[PDB]
Amino acid sequence: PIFLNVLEAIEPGVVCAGHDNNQPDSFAALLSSLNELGERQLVHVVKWAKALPGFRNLHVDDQMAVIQYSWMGLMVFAMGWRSFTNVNSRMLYFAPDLVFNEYRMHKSRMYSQCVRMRHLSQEFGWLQITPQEFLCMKALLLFSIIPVDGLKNQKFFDELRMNYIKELDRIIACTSCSRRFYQLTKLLDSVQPIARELHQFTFDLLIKSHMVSVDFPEMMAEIISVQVPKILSGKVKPIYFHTQ
């Protein structure tokens, strides 16, 4: 299992948010921590992605693009997995120091997004997703959202995404298999609408932020103002398996 060997080897370790749990929850503190966590995870997505099989086949501009477009979906998927594996979906395990109960879901002003993410967490258990299926599905997620007008070297992308689909098929093969691929691609598709709702909520925050003084940190301000509106305006869209 060469491919799985590699994905296990490069999988990033635990990441903390730096949140102060000794203080009562407030929207401002929760958002600062999500911003911090978000940036810390992005660093690890970059390290991870550059070490993926084939990733350097991509034009460097496309390498950079695909990470920024798919980072929120990658974080959603992984957070769902941690929630399932660490606490049986009873809460959302953003980080060991940032665990959301329903009161935090509410205080974050992202209650609906949180509920949908808790549902995603429960599906890992209903579907009995294996840790090896998780790793293959997460890698495929990186190659699941791109500009409608194409990437700089579309052909290299196409062949890379193909290989990751072949490798998910591989560990499903290794019929029932048909049913399995359906269930897993349905779950993957469901990540994208959730990421979009996170993007919409945060884009709106950023715009109003001069009165709400949400001091958006530099990396986040750049990605929310430069890259996220491409997704919100439809110029960048997920690659769905099934029709929505």
Partner: peptide, 11 residues
């Protein structure tokens, strides 16, 4: 940009 700096800083 910030993201490009970060991407380029990773081996």
């Amino acid at each position: 940009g910030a993201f490009q700096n970060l991407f380029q800083s990773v081996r």
